[PDB]
């Protein structure tokens, strides 16, 4: 048995590989849920900053999901539950930065504001229950109005009504929110047309 | 057992392109030998084939089938059956392998966008930009295209392979000032990396003949919102009675849209001061001199690989003025340390390179290339007598040797000793350098890159600009090799035989060796 020594020295790679290789070669090795869950947190703790490669975070998600079904009896099911939530929020934060980048560049070469709305909508659909739903929704609303401004004169009223639909959808989703003031100026500009 | 006569050809399913144009692009006619590849290679493999003519235009939801009918006697009648789907819109872009570089840095240089229609030229251009950026390996890049026929969209995976660029001197290539002044969440003992910004420091600490300090910083996306860049630098140096030089500069670059979108304009403003007493290798001997210079440079760059380019070109046209104090703006050894409190000149340059493959390429990508160079320069003067003692050209040899001094511009001319064509009292106010090269690489890899070449140079320089003559040159020839190191720049070996004489003497010609370091 070695993994816990590597875990105490914060060498997460060796701790992780000495734990997992032992409970892969025999379903519990001889340390059972302790090795599994130490390996799960060790794999979690190497997590990069939210805009690097993310390779270990998908692996962490699937490893914790498969832990929940190898040992559903464990009290560490909760400790994996909130961990997979934290990982999901980081994965969503990456996509949120992507959508923010497309809003920042804007109507530069290409379009980039239609890209912003579809990127953040993909975020909303791929991870339904994240914290960042408010930020993603307001980013949709801002990008909708931004597209409505610069569109060709034959195709502006439809973008305006899409913007007002997003306004009422944001109110339906969040009857109160800290971002309502800018939303309401967007509404007051678009409801005229 | 097969037939051998092409009796007719036919098309069905097409709407997007005219049937006669596809007859031409299929390169067939009735009354010709029946084959299979003759059709297939021209319909499913080659870059002008019909299938590629649909695929590259974003119509990826397609299929195709050569139908054979009337299989009688010697003949077959043929009909092209194809499927036209809906033009694919990009749904997602996934990028992986970026160990040490935020996605912010790379997604801003992509030419494709989510929500726009797919096209081959945009994807190829995006890969060219990534290759030229240099933070990833220029080889072993290929996109993982995945379509979805139910929603009719495509998502692109970009697997990338990383390499770190760093070399007394230091070449931090992905160093961030925002991460320096305010760490994100944990600096964790690491340098403040990211954002694609670069920082560089260099200097000599010999101090008994040479001493120097220098620093530079470059931000390719200033403000993080547009492709316009900021560049700043500064320097200082002693050399043994001594000579003192220091200065700084600030510059600003911008991508253009007029001829094409490869052109980049650059503007820069610079300051320098020279400090001397009882010094002797310059015409100036005692005093202090200044210069303010404004530079405009127009450049175009279209190559594929920085380290061993194989297609494209690199053109530059530059002009560098300092205000004309001799005219009414400023109006009024014998008196030469006089009147050069402020120095005056206007320097012009043209510089072009041109890389072609000679054996197809793409296939057997090790390839073989022919290069080509053509550099001209002029250091003009507003007034016949107040010619600048600083900024002159120095030519002959490796070129690197001249960076023991910073008041001149050193130009390599291979096969002629060092600084041979421009000795003391004959400083160069105009020059020309031409020359072919044929190159073959031995190895191209992430860590190290190797290639061998034979050249054919020709160059010259003049002390008097009015005697510029680009058809009277000191010819050369030779062979050489170069090495790129995992944690250092180039090192290479060049041998050359100088053919013509210099100033009536053959002493500097003949066999010569040059030892290149860093980068030309």
XYZ file of C-alpha atoms in Angstrom:
713
model
C 0.000 0.000 0.000
C 1.510 3.326 -1.083
C -1.135 5.702 -2.401
C -1.994 7.467 0.855
C 1.656 8.454 1.346
C 1.734 10.033 -2.118
C -1.620 11.663 -1.323
C -0.252 13.270 1.852
C 2.744 14.683 -0.038
C 0.282 16.173 -2.578
C 1.839 14.209 -5.466
C -1.578 13.559 -6.944
C -0.396 11.699 -10.057
C 1.463 8.918 -8.235
C -1.232 8.697 -5.562
C -3.894 8.386 -8.258
C -2.068 5.750 -10.273
C -1.112 3.633 -7.240
C -4.727 3.720 -6.049
C -6.431 3.011 -9.374
C -4.063 0.273 -10.575
C -4.850 -1.650 -7.383
C -8.652 -1.466 -7.586
C -8.549 -2.110 -11.325
C -6.541 -5.329 -10.946
C -8.952 -6.570 -8.253
C -12.339 -4.859 -7.654
C -11.447 -3.473 -4.189
C -7.756 -4.310 -3.828
C -7.611 -4.391 -0.059
C -8.545 -0.793 0.782
C -12.033 -0.627 -0.841
C -13.938 2.713 -0.804
C -11.022 4.584 0.760
C -8.753 3.923 -2.233
C -11.531 4.667 -4.742
C -12.468 7.987 -3.130
C -8.888 9.091 -2.461
C -8.240 8.405 -6.153
C -11.329 10.398 -7.109
C -10.247 13.442 -5.128
C -6.636 13.053 -6.303
C -7.848 13.087 -9.911
C -10.004 16.112 -9.055
C -7.135 18.051 -7.458
C -5.020 18.146 -10.651
C -7.781 20.160 -12.324
C -6.467 22.953 -14.580
C -7.611 26.543 -14.659
C -10.988 26.874 -16.423
C -9.504 27.737 -19.830
C -6.744 25.111 -20.290
C -7.004 21.609 -21.794
C -9.580 20.134 -19.317
C -8.493 16.583 -20.206
C -8.562 15.290 -16.622
C -11.986 16.780 -15.803
C -13.995 14.571 -18.186
C -12.066 11.580 -16.838
C -12.855 12.712 -13.291
C -16.555 13.031 -14.114
C -16.767 9.520 -15.552
C -14.617 8.010 -12.778
C -16.869 9.476 -10.084
C -20.016 8.384 -11.953
C -18.700 4.808 -12.104
C -17.769 5.019 -8.408
C -21.369 5.885 -7.549
C -22.473 2.561 -9.064
C -19.648 0.347 -7.787
C -20.333 1.485 -4.200
C -23.834 2.994 -3.981
C -23.816 2.105 -0.266
C -20.987 4.533 0.485
C -21.333 7.723 2.492
C -18.886 9.142 -0.079
C -21.673 9.171 -2.684
C -22.516 12.710 -1.510
C -18.850 13.684 -1.548
C -18.760 12.586 -5.194
C -22.104 14.255 -5.958
C -21.015 17.782 -5.131
C -17.637 17.101 -6.777
C -19.267 16.222 -10.104
C -21.369 19.380 -9.741
C -18.233 21.493 -9.255
C -16.647 19.845 -12.297
C -19.777 20.473 -14.379
C -19.713 24.152 -13.417
C -16.074 24.403 -14.525
C -16.880 22.747 -17.866
C -19.708 25.259 -18.310
C -17.393 28.136 -17.372
C -15.119 27.204 -20.282
C -18.014 27.521 -22.748
C -19.096 30.750 -21.034
C -15.659 32.258 -21.679
C -15.941 31.133 -25.311
C -19.285 32.910 -25.725
C -17.901 36.000 -23.976
C -15.007 36.054 -26.451
C -17.393 36.026 -29.400
C -19.332 38.895 -27.824
C -16.087 40.828 -27.253
C -14.905 40.527 -30.858
C -18.331 41.329 -32.270
C -19.080 42.379 -35.840
C -15.443 41.992 -36.841
C -14.600 39.857 -39.887
C -17.123 37.063 -39.842
C -20.178 37.715 -37.657
C -19.479 36.436 -34.075
C -22.705 37.641 -32.481
C -24.874 34.853 -33.924
C -22.012 32.589 -32.833
C -22.297 33.928 -29.276
C -25.984 33.078 -28.936
C -25.609 29.580 -30.343
C -22.541 28.918 -28.152
C -24.291 29.920 -24.938
C -27.472 28.097 -26.003
C -25.367 24.965 -26.503
C -24.085 25.560 -22.969
C -27.638 25.802 -21.619
C -28.727 22.600 -23.371
C -25.626 20.506 -22.608
C -25.597 21.184 -18.834
C -29.148 22.126 -17.816
C -28.862 22.820 -14.075
C -25.630 24.806 -13.657
C -25.186 27.955 -11.591
C -24.202 30.016 -14.658
C -27.696 29.873 -16.194
C -28.327 33.542 -15.313
C -25.110 34.735 -16.973
C -25.760 32.580 -20.036
C -29.324 33.905 -20.380
C -28.333 37.564 -20.089
C -25.560 36.941 -22.622
C -28.201 35.550 -25.002
C -30.288 38.687 -24.508
C -27.368 41.063 -25.093
C -26.207 39.192 -28.205
C -29.782 39.097 -29.542
C -30.104 42.880 -29.337
C -26.591 43.318 -30.740
C -27.474 41.215 -33.775
C -30.748 43.067 -34.199
C -28.881 46.374 -34.504
C -26.478 45.405 -37.310
C -28.708 43.165 -39.458
C -29.765 44.027 -43.008
C -32.839 46.213 -43.450
C -35.005 43.352 -44.755
C -34.298 41.205 -41.676
C -34.477 43.313 -38.498
C -38.028 43.016 -37.129
C -37.596 39.253 -36.693
C -34.399 39.749 -34.679
C -36.164 42.385 -32.560
C -39.019 40.004 -31.768
C -36.492 37.271 -30.964
C -34.889 39.742 -28.541
C -38.206 40.540 -26.848
C -38.961 36.808 -26.639
C -35.646 36.332 -24.827
C -36.563 39.230 -22.521
C -39.862 37.652 -21.489
C -38.174 34.239 -21.240
C -35.577 35.704 -18.868
C -38.339 37.183 -16.716
C -40.202 33.852 -16.748
C -37.026 32.030 -15.715
C -35.937 34.667 -13.169
C -38.768 36.886 -11.875
C -36.076 38.769 -9.927
C -32.445 39.183 -10.944
C -29.525 41.561 -10.443
C -29.234 42.052 -14.235
C -32.709 43.421 -14.972
C -31.785 47.090 -15.583
C -29.779 46.568 -18.784
C -32.373 44.006 -19.859
C -35.065 46.660 -19.458
C -33.206 49.211 -21.560
C -32.806 46.492 -24.214
C -36.576 46.014 -23.998
C -37.321 49.731 -24.202
C -35.193 50.038 -27.338
C -36.590 46.928 -29.052
C -40.309 47.107 -28.139
C -40.596 50.194 -30.352
C -40.183 47.791 -33.293
C -13.777 -9.921 -68.068
C -14.786 -6.359 -68.893
C -15.790 -4.009 -71.704
C -13.484 -1.405 -73.250
C -15.451 1.358 -75.063
C -16.921 4.537 -73.552
C -20.120 5.006 -75.546
C -21.963 7.738 -73.573
C -21.888 9.610 -70.252
C -24.824 11.046 -68.311
C -25.676 12.973 -65.125
C -28.574 12.819 -62.657
C -29.180 14.555 -59.329
C -27.151 17.724 -59.953
C -28.517 21.206 -59.342
C -25.607 23.269 -58.041
C -23.216 23.062 -61.012
C -23.774 23.053 -64.794
C -23.790 19.667 -66.512
C -21.370 20.681 -69.282
C -18.880 22.013 -66.727
C -18.977 18.628 -64.993
C -18.491 16.982 -68.384
C -15.324 19.070 -68.675
C -14.200 18.396 -65.092
C -14.789 14.660 -65.549
C -12.504 14.925 -68.625
C -14.381 12.410 -70.771
C -15.761 12.151 -74.271
C -17.706 9.529 -76.192
C -15.486 7.171 -78.172
C -12.677 6.571 -75.683
C -11.221 3.656 -73.727
C -13.441 2.410 -70.897
C -11.650 2.317 -67.542
C -12.621 2.787 -63.897
C -10.132 5.041 -62.121
C -10.348 7.308 -65.181
C -13.829 7.993 -63.779
C -13.244 7.333 -60.081
C -9.939 9.153 -59.608
C -11.596 12.097 -61.351
C -14.745 11.831 -59.238
C -13.632 10.726 -55.738
C -9.868 11.177 -55.191
C -8.368 14.200 -56.949
C -8.555 17.816 -55.802
C -10.579 18.918 -58.857
C -12.932 15.918 -58.736
C -16.693 16.430 -58.585
C -17.004 14.893 -55.123
C -14.436 17.335 -53.769
C -16.164 20.126 -55.695
C -19.194 19.448 -53.493
C -17.307 18.583 -50.285
C -15.071 21.667 -50.183
C -18.095 23.952 -50.689
C -19.731 22.848 -47.426
C -22.022 20.184 -48.941
C -20.681 17.262 -46.919
C -23.958 15.294 -46.908
C -23.422 13.729 -50.325
C -22.862 10.388 -52.034
C -22.151 9.262 -55.580
C -22.426 6.170 -57.785
C -21.302 5.317 -61.345
C -24.222 3.468 -62.955
C -23.352 1.192 -65.887
C -25.970 0.362 -68.538
C -26.089 -0.938 -72.122
C -23.214 -3.357 -71.459
C -23.150 -4.684 -75.015
C -20.514 -5.529 -77.608
C -17.502 -3.352 -76.844
C -19.320 -0.605 -74.992
C -20.804 0.687 -71.750
C -23.128 3.653 -71.270
C -22.510 5.516 -68.017
C -24.699 7.681 -65.784
C -23.511 9.695 -62.778
C -25.951 9.370 -59.858
C -25.369 11.706 -56.899
C -27.055 13.128 -53.796
C -27.178 16.836 -52.927
C -27.768 17.446 -49.231
C -28.106 20.632 -47.219
C -25.084 22.883 -46.779
C -23.494 22.266 -43.410
C -23.446 24.874 -40.642
C -20.788 24.664 -37.928
C -22.278 23.717 -34.548
C -19.249 23.401 -32.247
C -15.460 23.718 -32.207
C -13.466 21.574 -29.766
C -9.770 22.228 -29.147
C -7.413 20.082 -27.074
C -3.746 19.744 -26.198
C -3.258 23.335 -24.971
C -1.165 22.681 -21.870
C 0.190 26.202 -21.428
C -1.982 28.515 -23.525
C -5.537 29.690 -22.873
C -8.198 29.011 -25.505
C -8.657 32.790 -25.612
C -5.349 32.990 -27.477
C -6.250 30.507 -30.232
C -10.013 30.875 -30.775
C -9.384 34.520 -31.711
C -7.172 33.466 -34.654
C -9.558 30.858 -36.075
C -11.228 31.781 -39.353
C -14.214 29.470 -38.868
C -17.034 30.406 -36.503
C -19.866 28.436 -34.938
C -23.042 29.395 -36.773
C -21.518 30.033 -40.209
C -21.387 27.706 -43.191
C -18.541 25.245 -43.691
C -15.857 25.825 -46.324
C -12.441 24.288 -46.998
C -10.591 27.575 -47.552
C -11.573 28.942 -44.131
C -10.416 25.753 -42.385
C -7.112 25.643 -44.278
C -6.486 29.328 -43.526
C -7.192 28.748 -39.828
C -4.658 25.917 -39.747
C -2.147 28.179 -41.519
C -2.623 30.862 -38.859
C -2.145 28.309 -36.076
C 1.004 26.954 -37.747
C 2.499 30.427 -38.166
C 1.678 31.390 -34.569
C 4.383 28.992 -33.378
C 3.041 28.086 -29.926
C 2.141 24.622 -31.274
C 4.011 22.189 -33.488
C 3.641 23.134 -37.185
C 3.614 19.430 -38.143
C 1.176 16.631 -37.262
C -1.918 18.866 -37.248
C -5.200 17.589 -38.698
C -8.818 18.455 -37.823
C -11.243 15.802 -36.560
C -14.331 16.599 -38.634
C -17.572 15.057 -37.339
C -20.858 15.675 -39.195
C -24.393 15.044 -37.937
C -26.984 14.154 -40.611
C -30.018 14.547 -38.349
C -29.438 18.213 -37.466
C -27.376 18.801 -40.624
C -24.448 20.442 -38.837
C -20.742 19.751 -38.369
C -18.414 20.144 -35.390
C -14.630 20.338 -35.720
C -12.121 18.883 -33.275
C -8.668 20.472 -33.263
C -6.169 18.146 -31.557
C -2.925 20.079 -31.130
C 0.552 19.153 -29.904
C 2.347 21.626 -27.653
C 5.947 22.830 -27.532
C 7.576 25.440 -25.289
C 9.763 28.192 -26.769
C 12.528 29.399 -24.412
C 16.348 29.551 -24.434
C 22.868 35.365 -21.379
C 19.295 35.780 -22.628
C 15.702 34.606 -22.160
C 12.865 34.292 -24.693
C 9.626 33.950 -22.698
C 7.099 33.512 -25.519
C 3.760 33.085 -23.661
C 4.223 35.437 -20.695
C 1.256 37.484 -19.428
C 1.353 40.882 -17.715
C -2.229 40.573 -16.436
C -1.328 37.288 -14.736
C 1.717 39.091 -13.296
C -0.046 42.099 -11.759
C -3.099 40.104 -10.582
C -2.826 36.307 -10.478
C -6.004 34.543 -11.463
C -6.517 32.057 -8.609
C -3.073 30.561 -7.854
C 0.329 31.503 -9.247
C 1.607 28.331 -7.539
C 5.275 29.282 -7.925
C 5.015 29.316 -11.724
C 5.805 32.210 -14.042
C 2.720 34.244 -15.042
C 2.102 32.391 -18.301
C -0.663 32.888 -20.849
C -2.245 35.332 -23.298
C 0.370 34.741 -26.024
C 2.306 37.854 -24.995
C 6.100 37.643 -25.118
C 8.962 39.061 -23.044
C 12.694 38.953 -23.781
C 15.895 39.967 -21.947
C 19.533 39.831 -23.094
C 22.922 41.261 -22.186
C 26.688 40.858 -21.910
C 28.378 40.835 -18.489
C 32.015 40.554 -19.597
C 32.637 44.128 -18.387
C 36.340 44.224 -19.290
C 35.722 44.689 -23.019
C 31.912 44.469 -23.449
C 28.819 45.147 -21.318
C 25.184 45.507 -22.333
C 21.596 45.317 -21.088
C 18.373 44.980 -23.079
C 14.659 44.214 -22.665
C 11.647 43.954 -24.988
C 7.910 43.221 -24.798
C 5.314 42.488 -27.490
C 1.518 42.179 -27.200
C -0.067 40.801 -30.402
C -3.696 41.625 -29.421
C -3.713 44.919 -27.518
C -6.905 45.298 -25.514
C -7.796 41.686 -26.320
C -10.431 42.819 -28.821
C -8.798 43.595 -32.208
C -5.727 42.476 -34.195
C -3.559 45.498 -33.508
C -0.368 45.081 -31.529
C 1.982 46.972 -29.216
C 5.777 46.648 -29.145
C 8.293 48.318 -26.803
C 11.995 47.811 -26.052
C 15.091 49.453 -24.539
C 18.858 48.870 -24.459
C 22.207 50.058 -23.009
C 25.873 49.102 -23.522
C 29.510 49.963 -22.623
C 32.585 49.091 -24.622
C 36.169 50.002 -23.729
C 38.053 55.751 -22.741
C 34.758 54.120 -23.757
C 31.601 54.425 -25.879
C 28.091 54.702 -24.431
C 24.849 53.830 -26.232
C 21.257 53.609 -24.983
C 17.744 54.112 -26.314
C 14.162 52.873 -26.516
C 11.295 52.576 -28.996
C 7.525 52.085 -29.283
C 5.592 50.580 -32.193
C 2.080 49.765 -33.356
C 0.959 47.179 -35.921
C -2.277 46.670 -37.862
C -3.685 44.126 -40.319
C -5.017 45.644 -43.549
C -8.025 44.900 -45.764
C -7.195 46.729 -49.065
C -5.019 44.452 -51.263
C -5.934 41.339 -49.281
C -6.025 40.313 -45.613
C -2.395 39.119 -45.532
C -0.914 42.637 -45.602
C 0.211 44.106 -42.278
C 1.221 47.734 -41.763
C 3.521 48.771 -38.922
C 4.551 52.162 -37.528
C 7.265 52.780 -34.944
C 8.935 55.715 -33.172
C 12.432 55.401 -31.702
C 15.019 57.331 -29.680
C 18.749 56.728 -29.248
C 21.725 58.519 -27.682
C 25.445 57.996 -28.261
C 27.963 59.165 -25.661
C 31.695 59.361 -26.350
C 35.106 60.795 -25.617
C 38.523 59.973 -27.208
C 36.905 57.108 -29.171
C 38.320 56.223 -32.572
C 36.434 53.552 -34.591
C 33.700 55.987 -35.515
C 34.223 59.200 -37.436
C 32.829 60.980 -34.321
C 35.357 61.222 -31.510
C 34.111 63.584 -28.763
C 30.528 64.525 -27.938
C 26.928 63.370 -27.633
C 24.438 62.759 -30.447
C 20.685 62.178 -30.700
C 18.168 60.904 -33.242
C 14.371 60.699 -33.418
C 13.059 58.365 -36.109
C 9.597 57.515 -37.451
C 9.294 54.294 -39.453
C 6.558 52.965 -41.732
C 6.770 49.336 -42.861
C 4.427 47.531 -45.262
C 4.747 43.746 -45.238
C 2.974 40.653 -46.546
C 3.601 37.115 -45.307
C 1.975 33.944 -46.640
C 4.256 31.009 -45.713
C 3.096 27.790 -44.033
C 5.865 26.755 -41.599
C 8.202 29.239 -39.844
C 11.081 26.801 -39.472
C 11.117 25.092 -42.894
C 8.703 26.935 -45.200
C 7.542 25.191 -48.315
C 5.065 27.558 -50.024
C 4.304 31.267 -49.999
C 6.356 34.433 -49.836
C 7.532 37.151 -47.445
C 7.679 40.720 -48.800
C 8.650 43.869 -46.899
C 8.978 47.531 -47.900
C 10.214 49.989 -45.280
C 11.085 53.686 -44.993
C 12.588 55.382 -41.927
C 12.718 59.184 -41.628
C 14.199 61.591 -39.109
C 13.164 65.241 -39.321
C 15.136 67.424 -41.794
C 16.891 69.930 -39.537
C 19.037 71.138 -42.456
C 15.985 72.771 -44.070
C 14.140 75.897 -42.896
C 12.720 73.918 -39.958
C 16.155 74.023 -38.312
C 18.202 76.188 -40.721
C 21.680 77.248 -39.525
C 38.726 66.207 -38.620
C 37.678 69.796 -39.337
C 34.157 70.306 -37.936
C 32.589 66.902 -38.050
C 31.808 66.428 -34.334
C 29.985 69.702 -34.997
C 26.529 69.842 -36.644
C 25.827 66.259 -35.582
C 24.327 67.112 -32.270
C 21.251 65.819 -34.140
C 21.863 63.350 -36.999
C 19.860 63.404 -40.235
C 18.967 60.712 -42.776
C 16.167 58.816 -44.464
C 16.711 55.074 -44.890
C 14.848 52.883 -47.395
C 14.687 49.094 -47.632
C 13.091 46.384 -49.762
C 13.258 42.734 -48.739
C 11.639 39.718 -50.398
C 11.792 35.944 -50.081
C 10.060 33.287 -52.109
C 9.758 29.569 -51.322
C 8.593 26.962 -53.846
C 8.483 23.166 -53.620
C 10.043 21.246 -56.470
C 8.558 17.756 -55.966
C 4.782 18.052 -55.384
C 4.784 18.066 -51.534
C 1.814 17.048 -49.315
C 2.784 13.536 -50.376
C 6.158 12.514 -48.893
C 5.996 15.760 -46.893
C 9.751 15.745 -46.228
C 9.893 17.330 -49.686
C 12.567 19.490 -51.327
C 12.328 23.254 -51.778
C 13.925 26.071 -53.767
C 14.220 29.392 -51.974
C 15.080 32.900 -53.272
C 16.207 36.210 -51.701
C 16.376 39.842 -52.874
C 17.386 42.703 -50.489
C 18.097 46.331 -51.382
C 18.887 49.313 -49.177
C 19.567 53.058 -49.356
C 20.663 55.524 -46.661
C 19.853 58.886 -48.225
C 20.689 62.355 -46.960
C 18.846 65.673 -47.029
C 22.092 67.673 -47.282
C 25.259 66.728 -49.153
C 27.620 67.573 -46.276
C 25.594 66.573 -43.189
C 25.599 62.837 -43.916
C 24.782 60.660 -40.918
C 27.709 58.879 -39.210
C 25.262 56.446 -37.547
C 22.958 53.809 -38.995
C 25.236 52.928 -41.914
C 25.403 49.442 -43.404
C 28.149 46.885 -42.795
C 28.404 43.851 -45.056
C 30.462 40.656 -45.409
C 30.493 37.384 -43.529
C 28.152 35.974 -40.899
C 26.377 39.229 -40.036
C 26.042 38.213 -36.384
C 29.521 39.567 -35.620
C 28.252 43.130 -36.100
C 25.999 42.943 -33.027
C 29.052 43.677 -30.941
C 28.022 47.229 -31.950
C 24.589 48.865 -32.197
C 25.179 52.054 -34.226
C 25.384 50.127 -37.523
C 23.279 47.577 -39.399
C 25.121 44.340 -40.189
C 24.354 42.388 -43.367
C 25.560 38.862 -44.053
C 27.237 38.207 -47.406
C 28.335 34.588 -47.474
C 31.797 33.677 -48.721
C 33.684 36.891 -47.843
C 35.571 36.930 -44.500
C 33.684 39.284 -42.142
C 32.757 42.951 -42.686
C 35.117 42.779 -45.649
C 33.344 44.907 -48.270
C 32.930 47.817 -45.807
C 36.199 48.631 -44.016
C 37.098 51.704 -41.964
C 36.473 54.888 -43.943
C 34.230 53.124 -46.495
C 31.018 52.745 -44.512
C 28.103 51.528 -46.607
C 25.366 53.964 -47.620
C 23.755 51.585 -50.151
C 23.761 47.825 -50.618
C 22.279 44.958 -52.598
C 22.113 41.248 -51.754
C 20.554 38.578 -53.974
C 20.752 34.786 -54.111
C 19.083 31.398 -54.755
C 19.159 28.424 -52.333
C 18.203 24.744 -52.769
C 17.315 22.989 -49.506
C 16.537 19.434 -48.331
C 15.526 18.531 -44.757
C 17.013 15.533 -42.989
C 14.549 15.535 -40.079
C 11.482 17.544 -39.037
C 10.231 16.906 -35.495
C 8.755 18.660 -32.467
C 12.059 19.053 -30.614
C 14.693 19.378 -33.365
C 14.708 20.201 -37.088
C 17.553 19.686 -39.577
C 18.201 20.674 -43.187
C 21.053 20.948 -45.709
C 21.398 23.414 -48.575
C 23.487 24.664 -51.470
C 23.476 28.354 -52.327
C 24.473 30.830 -55.042
C 24.785 34.295 -53.422
C 25.749 37.733 -54.872
C 26.106 41.082 -53.019
C 27.828 44.472 -52.812
C 27.828 47.798 -50.965
C 28.819 51.368 -51.838
C 30.216 54.260 -49.816
C 28.516 56.678 -52.242
C 24.794 56.309 -52.932
C 25.098 57.910 -56.388
C 27.208 54.940 -57.580
C 24.596 52.292 -56.718
C 24.774 49.557 -59.361
C 22.855 46.321 -58.695
C 24.450 44.632 -61.744
C 28.033 44.876 -60.399
C 28.192 42.350 -57.560
C 30.685 40.177 -55.681
C 29.513 36.675 -56.622
C 29.815 33.505 -54.466
C 28.727 29.831 -54.071
C 28.795 26.986 -51.518
C 27.012 24.525 -49.231
C 25.834 24.336 -45.622
C 23.706 22.770 -42.880
C 21.581 24.054 -39.984
C 20.297 22.736 -36.645
C 17.296 23.801 -34.533
C 17.635 22.889 -30.828
C 14.866 22.067 -28.295
C 15.918 24.888 -25.940
C 18.114 27.128 -28.160
C 17.721 28.712 -31.602
C 19.585 27.888 -34.806
C 23.176 26.766 -35.097
C 24.612 26.012 -38.515
C 27.670 25.594 -40.702
C 28.159 27.367 -44.046
C 31.067 27.021 -46.475
C 31.450 29.396 -49.404
C 33.971 30.237 -52.114
C 34.226 33.932 -52.948
C 34.881 34.283 -56.655
C 35.471 37.997 -57.328
C 38.103 40.275 -55.767
C 37.554 43.221 -53.401
C 39.086 46.674 -54.027
C 41.626 45.053 -56.348
C 42.813 42.497 -53.771
C 42.108 38.755 -53.789
C 43.000 38.439 -50.091
C 39.388 38.146 -48.902
C 38.137 35.718 -51.565
C 38.527 31.984 -51.901
C 37.341 29.389 -49.424
C 35.603 30.745 -46.320
C 33.619 29.317 -43.400
C 30.745 30.925 -41.492
C 29.242 29.832 -38.177
C 25.638 31.041 -37.835
C 23.885 31.256 -34.459
C 20.506 32.449 -33.233
C 18.653 33.329 -36.430
C 19.461 35.422 -39.499
